[PDB]
């Protein structure tokens, strides 16, 4: 999740500290997952062949 | 633009003192929030 998050410490108590989304740093990209397609299709063919039986 | 999934929000709260209070801004996914009924609130 390529984002440098800033923790805004909000006093709403006394004591109680609320955290607000600090100004997200610059360029904007959403979370992801790089899945090795080689490892993905590997276990795919293994189980699928256990099913025509 | 190039829309945006999230929102640059702002709203009202309290602070260390009782009388005096506090507005502060945060950023929420449009999944975390929803509209209500002038701009969209």
């Amino acid at each position: 999740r390529p984002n440098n998050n800033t923790r805004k410490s909000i006093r709403i108590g006394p004591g109680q500290a609320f955290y607000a989304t600090g100004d997200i740093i610059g360029d904007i990209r959403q979370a992801h997952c790089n899945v090795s397609k080689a490892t993905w299709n590997e276990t795919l063919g293994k189980v699928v062949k256990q099913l025509r039986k | 633009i190039t829309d945006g999934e999230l929102k640059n929000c702002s709203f009202n709260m309290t602070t260390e003192l009782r009388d005096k209070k506090q507005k502060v801004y945060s950023l929420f996914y449009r999944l975390d929030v929803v509209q209500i009924n002038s701009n969209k609130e």
Partner: antibody
Amino acid sequence: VQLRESGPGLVKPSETLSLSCTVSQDSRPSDHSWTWVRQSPGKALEWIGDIHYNGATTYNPSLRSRVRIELDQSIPRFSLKMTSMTAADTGMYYCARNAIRIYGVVALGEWFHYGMDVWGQGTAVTVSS
Amino acid sequence: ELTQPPSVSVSPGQTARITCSGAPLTSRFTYWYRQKPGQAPVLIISRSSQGRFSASWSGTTVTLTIRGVQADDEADYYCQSSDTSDSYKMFGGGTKLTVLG
């Protein structure tokens, strides 16, 4: 980035026309979109189409069913094709480089447009006999 | 049809503004070019990330602001971005900048 268009510049009415643009002298080119922009004599520069090396070409609406953009990426010399020609398409034709700048990974598209920062010398194109 | 002025005027020293109006300017960033009559349209406005030349976005319009009009800058200026469907591009008119004096 030399944009050496090797072309004729003259063609007959109702037949077809082909252009080229030898892309030479470079070290980060196919990042960006290769386009063709035309200007009728003293008129508006008007977009024709562009090509992203992978084959994802795009075309100007009222032209899309006649204009084609090829890719001899081995040379590399990319080409352009127009058909059913009249004198109305006469003017200056500028090959240009629609730039793309990325911070991350292509699959999620972490890039914007920089603009057409490399316009070629151009070829004066004429339709007559 | 992108709504530009085909020409604007300014005197030796003042600043100027060219407004390219339309519909898709509430969605796509705006890029600009400088074609001195017969030259290669020079790129000047970009989105390098999400000095004397700039352009201010404003709703249906994006206003090209030019500061420091030396007579060296007399040219046709063209606004160009993209429609809302991210398929095709096209250009506006071609603003001849006049330099008085």
